[PDB]
Design a protein around this ligand. Structure first.
Ligand SMILES: *[C@@H]1O[C@H](CO)[C@@H](O)[C@H](O)[C@H]1NC(C)=O
Lengths: 107, 122, 421
């Protein structure tokens, strides 16, 4: 089985600044990784996949980076509808496993 | 313009089964795969399994082997899921998923449905 | 510059002397244009993508539409889906008592008698037990789609069909044979029409295919991604023989106005199921070479082969057709080998059940009945390609199983070379 950990569930943030979020894996997941943006009451949508390539309609605010067993996502000059939770999912092999999710909240 | 639609659900009894149906529109149904995921408080997003809609071959989870059953229907372009032998921890919302990279390298799934609550009580 | 367009179909100078217009349509008005010329060109390199190409859907749509429109002027079988009271009191063989012999129905026939007791022979997988007693049975296909008898005029063989681009368009098949069909290729042989592709339908295997360049190859999506459907081509063709040994009786039950429906009479000769033979030495060397070249794709851990899982009949069997009859062979023991990391003797045999009524395709649409034929039937062919599929576990063994899960994977093994510009 493949187990991940993330950053703690609360990240301090302000409107229009940078937000660094990361999650660590336990085995070799190569670059088979993706992220999802979970808003309550709504089914989430993929925003970044394979740590480099973005999906159409998703802007350039979400920059993914990293390799191996730890992966980072940088949010530069964020707008208020990125105040939701973020999950990271590996797709290396086997039955899949999800992260625990961290929310973005105003202090 | 791809869309997944699934309807509502009601309460069922423990030791029984439950019927879940999803339908697809926009893209040709026989060319990607259908995944099932589950959201609940106090748990993560546990993987259920995936189904080929063209053929009958499926793949399951070792935690949920034997308690789930899968069915494709290409006439109505629907995916049918049957959780059986309910347990009180399974009160959860359920989601369908359209995969990408059909018959190639399945990497990340993007198109999701509305998602439906199911609650078990005696 | 690449674009999206619709091609046409062509044929050779061979014409139907029996004049079966319906299947003659495959080459009824399609121009022979049998003048295939080759050219060579240089300074071309571009990321070819066989998975995301354009004309495989074109091939699939015209093959399925040809199969649908080949049966419209034929007879409709629809007034046969009625109650089947099948008794099986006698037994020439022990495996006949489950809904096969003297399966009788009350039919209103051509002579205006409402309740004639007319019986037929049917196959036990092709029939289903109705929700009640065991004395009544039902056809497994008329529950879902409308069944249609096949005429004698639609008797089919694989015609080596040819695709020709219209004016203002061109096609490019890259010369490099080693090309995996996913990436930058090299100097381009350019034609106006490709070599012949035969529209044969198959599962888990490629029969009457096209050979390789001198050694086997492994093609799919870029290894950077998690490849699943792997098409393997081979340089050593292996002969396969599949046969049924029983002469059959063909009877006529008139159900349409002025036309005929053909059903199965009694079995003549000693009765066995269908059986196929594979040479053991060529099969073992073939799997040895496939394992020893598939190792360099994944040079870290063990690889193994497993038979396919359940869900329906097509993925669990090797499904093909010969002589107008559909064959489902077990093939489970052919993929039980396991290997380690870091010329014809003792031939192997496999059982093979036969079928009459197929669900065919287009479930928004019709479905097929296949009429029976007499005499012992042998069908010999060459296998060329495999359609194995990859799964990975938490252990150090990468599993593979025959599959693919699409008919488009069958066409994509020979149509990978070509795109339109
Ligand atoms: C093939 O034969 C094996 C032998 O026991 C059997 O387990 C398997 O179910 C068979 N598969 C089919 C599709 O008949």
């Amino acid at each position: 089985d493949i187990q991940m950990t993330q950053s703690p569930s609360s990240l301090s943030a302000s409107v229009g600044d940078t937000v660094t979020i990361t999650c660590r894996a336990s085995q070799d997941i190569n670059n088979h990784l993706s992220w999802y943006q979970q808003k309550p009451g709504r089914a989430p949508k993929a925003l970044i996949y394979s740590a480099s390539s973005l999906e159409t309609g998703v802007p350039s605010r979400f920059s993914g980076s990293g390799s191996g067993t730890d992966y980072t996502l940088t949010i530069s000059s964020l707008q208020p509808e990125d105040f939701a939770t973020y999950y990271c999912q590996h797709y290396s092999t086997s039955p899949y496993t999800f992260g625990r999710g961290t929310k973005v909240d105003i202090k | 313009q791809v869309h997944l639609e699934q309807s509502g659900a009601e309460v069922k009894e423990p030791g029984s089964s439950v019927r879940l149906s999803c339908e697809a529109s926009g893209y040709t149904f026989t060319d990607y795969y259908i995944h099932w995921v589950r959201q609940s408080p106090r748990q993560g997003l546990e993987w259920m399994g995936w189904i080929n809609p063209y053929y009958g071959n499926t793949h399951y989870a070792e935690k949920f082997q034997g308690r789930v059953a899968m069915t494709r229907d290409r006439s109505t372009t629907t995916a049918y899921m049957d959780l059986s032998s309910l347990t009180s921890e399974d009160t959860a919302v359920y989601y369908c998923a359209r995969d990408e990279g059909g018959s190639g390298s399945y990497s990340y799934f993007d198109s999701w449905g509305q998602g439906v609550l199911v609650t078990v009580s005696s | 510059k690449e674009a999206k367009t619709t091609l046409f179909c062509a044929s050779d100078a061979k014409a139907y002397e029996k004049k079966v217009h319906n299947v003659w349509a495959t080459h009824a008005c399609v121009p022979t244009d049998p003048n295939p010329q080759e050219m060579v060109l240089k300074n071309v390199t571009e990321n070819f993508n066989m998975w995301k190409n354009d004309m495989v859907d074109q091939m699939h749509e015209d093959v399925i539409s040809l199969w649908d429109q080949s049966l419209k002027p034929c007879v409709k079988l629809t007034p046969l889906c009625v109650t089947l009271n099948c008794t099986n009191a006698t037994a020439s063989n022990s495996s006949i008592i489950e809904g096969m012999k003297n399966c009788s129905f009350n039919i209103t026939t051509e002579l205006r008698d409402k309740r004639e007791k007319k019986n037929a022979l049917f196959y036990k997988l092709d029939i289903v037990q109705l929700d009640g007693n065991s004395s009544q049975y039902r056809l497994i296909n008329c529950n879902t789609s409308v069944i249609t008898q096949a005429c004698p005029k639609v008797s089919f063989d694989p015609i080596p069909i040819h695709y020709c681009a219209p004016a203002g368009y061109a096609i490019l098949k890259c010369n490099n044979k080693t090309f995996t069909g996913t990436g930058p290729c090299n100097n381009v042989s350019t034609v106006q029409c490709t070599h012949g592709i035969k529209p044969v339908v198959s599962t888990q295997l490629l029969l009457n295919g096209s050979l390789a360049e001198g050694e086997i190859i492994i093609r799919s999506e870029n290894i950077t991604n998690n490849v699943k459907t792997i098409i393997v081509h081979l340089n050593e063709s292996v002969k396969i023989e599949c046969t049924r040994p029983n002469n059959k009786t063909r009877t006529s039950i008139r159900i349409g106005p002025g036309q005929w429906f053909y059903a199965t009479g009694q079995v003549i000769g000693d009765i066995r199921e269908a059986y196929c033979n594979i040479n053991e030495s060529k099969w073992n060397e073939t799997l040895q070479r496939v394992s020893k070249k598939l190792k360099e794709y994944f040079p870290h851990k063990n690889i193994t082969f497993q038979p396919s899982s359940g869900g329906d009949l097509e993925i669990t069997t090797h499904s093909f057709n010969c002589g107008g009859e559909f064959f489902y062979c077990n093939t489970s023991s052919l993929f039980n080998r396991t290997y380690m990391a870091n010329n014809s003797t003792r031939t192997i045999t496999i059982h093979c059940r036969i079928k009459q009524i197929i669900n065919m395709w287009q479930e928004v649409g019709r479905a097929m009945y296949a009429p029976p034929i007499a005499g012992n039937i042998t069908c010999i062919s060459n296998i060329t390609g495999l359609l194995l599929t990859r799964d990975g576990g938490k252990n150090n063994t990468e599993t593979f199983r025959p599959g693919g899960g699409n008919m488009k994977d069958n066409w994509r093994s020979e149509l990978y070379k070509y795109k339109v510009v």
